[PDB]
Amino acid sequence: ASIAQARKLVEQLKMEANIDRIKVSKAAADLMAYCEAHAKEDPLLTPVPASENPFR
Amino acid sequence: LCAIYITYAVIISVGILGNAILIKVFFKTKSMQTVPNIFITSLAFGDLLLLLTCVPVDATHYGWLFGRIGKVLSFIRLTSVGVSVFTLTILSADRYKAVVKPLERQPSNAILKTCVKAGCVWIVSMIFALPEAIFCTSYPVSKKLLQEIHSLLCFLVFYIIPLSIISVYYSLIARTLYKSTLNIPTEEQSHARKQIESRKRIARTVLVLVALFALCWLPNHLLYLYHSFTSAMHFIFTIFSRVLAFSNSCVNPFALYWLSKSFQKHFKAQL
């Protein structure tokens, strides 16, 4: 009954535990790298002139 | 003597202030912006025009100070009276439809329909103001039968049909509310008795509004008819008749203030 579900959850958390974890510093660093890489591809962030805007 | 003019001034100032506050509340607050409010603000505009046109005439009386073409004043007065009376009739019809036939709805995205109705009412009133384009009296002495027929036409068009429609529709509204006050859970108050009192109060206010329309608009047309048929101490009567004539449009927004509590809150907020 509940023993099988307990075993399943324990196995799940065990395979969750042994995963490679990345330091949050370089995580934030590459988040900034990605957002600055696509900075000018974002018309919402940087509005484009209305000549090519299809939403006059 | 001069005491009668004090009542004139206070009544006209109260009416102008009431309609100004009503239009200010309607335009500032988007919460009360929908189909029923279009005709209410049309009535507010009509009363504002009627009072702003009633100011210069007794300002001048106390020949004529304005110009001959300054014709346009009588035209604007007649079209303001027309739009006020006809918008009263249209509001009466809308309230009858809302109260007596609630399941059969229609307002939702019909802003175009109500705007078209209001514009047609205003244009028809403007056209009815045209027959006065002859000529600050409206007609000369020679027009004996012509002034008679114009007086009868104006009296009937502006007082018989609209009063009949308003009285019938509003009496039906009051009867429907008095009958529907018995379809409420009754016992265990704070949710049922309040509805009883509200419906009874609405019916009484509606009946008082009809009676006040009739009483306030009767003397002006009565005096016009008597003058057309055929001034020693009648000037006080003329002044009182005019005050009673324009007091109805003054009291028109006071009924909305009296009934709606949300309108009361908005009125106090924008006061």
Binding site: A6, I19, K23, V24, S25, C35, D42, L44, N53, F55 | -
Partner: protein
């Protein structure tokens, strides 16, 4: 034995929390303190798509960024052309309680679901010029909350029975079932590379799933109420959760921990929809308070409000090119912002 199982479970939870804390070097704001703030951003309603009767729960843009599908509680599924407001399609629904809708990446089919517990697929292109149900997917116990097309023949659906499933339109069978959530699953979002998806449920937790294998890769916590919306970062290594406690949070799969909180004292209502921009620098979120707020996903400082809806904003999406934002709402109105 249950007691020893619980003891080892709690000790491994403690050790995983300790490892998660140890992997944390510095906060997101400290690293992103020198970045130039995006500043106030103004968005105007370029188009207002009218024609829906009842309140609108979901919408989805097509890959072409021209067409989009919206679902309303009046039982109508309308496909618009946001460029010209012309209604390309208007599909009547068997069940008028639709809670989600989708647009296939190929653009050939659309899907919807709701209280009927069934995901219905409609073929948009037919020789006769009419749209009919291509397939009915049944098997979910609870109401459908979300569904996204992996491809022309695969779809992942989330239902209210605390489960997520991967289907096959050709055979109408559950290829893989994802189990483990405790409460109703409210939203999901496929990864940009179509290899993983994340699910936000009402158990105040989010889980990362892999479609190919079919097990919970990672579990994320931190919210204190039901999570109503969720979406992936454009790079695919992060996702944002919009929950009912009036807060939004960012999670990084690599760090396996909460990154940033998007909350304010004035806002007390929960999040209804969450989506990023083309670059991910901008996080838009719908709110119960009739307005849509715009968050700067790096600094956690608001940068705009998409006011203009006189009812609840229940859904919002950003085009693939990021050139428009459509926000459906409970007033039966869609608005294109640019």
């Amino acid at each position: 034995e249950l007691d020893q199982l619980r003891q080892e479970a709690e000790q491994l939870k403690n050790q995983i929390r300790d490892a998660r804390k140890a992997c944390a070097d510095a906060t997101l704001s400290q690293i992103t303190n020198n970045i130039d703030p995006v500043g106030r951003i103004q968005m105007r309603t370029r188009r207002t798509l009218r024609g829906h009767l009842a309140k609108i729960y979901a919408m989805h843009w097509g890959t072409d960024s021209r067409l989009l599908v919206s679902a309303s509680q009046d039982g109508k599924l309308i496909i618009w052309d946001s460029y010209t407001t012309n209604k390309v399609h208007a599909i009547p629904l068997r069940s008028s309680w639709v809670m989600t809708c989708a647009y296939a990446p190929s653009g050939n089919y659309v899907a919807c679901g709701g209280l009927d517990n069934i995901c219905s697929i409609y073929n948009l292109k037919t020789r006769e010029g009419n749209v009919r149900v291509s397939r009915e997917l049944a098997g979910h116990t609870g109401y459908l909350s979300c569904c996204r097309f992996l491809d022309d023949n695969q779809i992942v659906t989330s239902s209210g029975d605390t489960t997520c499933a991967l289907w096959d339109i050709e055979t109408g069978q559950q290829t893989t079932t994802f189990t483990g959530h405790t409460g109703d699953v409210m939203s999901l979002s496929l990864a940009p590379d179509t290899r993983l998806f994340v699910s936000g449920a009402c158990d105040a937790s989010a889980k990362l799933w892999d479609v190919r294998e079919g097990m919970c890769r990672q579990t994320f916590t931190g919210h204190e109420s039901d999570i109503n919306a969720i979406c992936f970062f454009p790079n695919g290594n992060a996702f944002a959760t919009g929950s009912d406690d009036a807060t939004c949070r960012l999670f990084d799969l690599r760090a396996d921990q909460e990154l940033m909180t998007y909350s304010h004292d004035n806002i007390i209502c929960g999040i209804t929809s969450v989506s990023f921009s083309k670059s991910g620098r901008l996080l838009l979120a719908g709110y119960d308070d009739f307005n849509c707020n715009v968050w700067d996903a790096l600094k956690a400082d608001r940068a705009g409000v998409l006011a203009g809806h006189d009812n609840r904003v229940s859904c919002l999406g950003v085009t693939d090119d990021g050139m428009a934002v459509a926000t459906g709402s409970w007033d039966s109105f869609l608005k294109i912002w640019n």
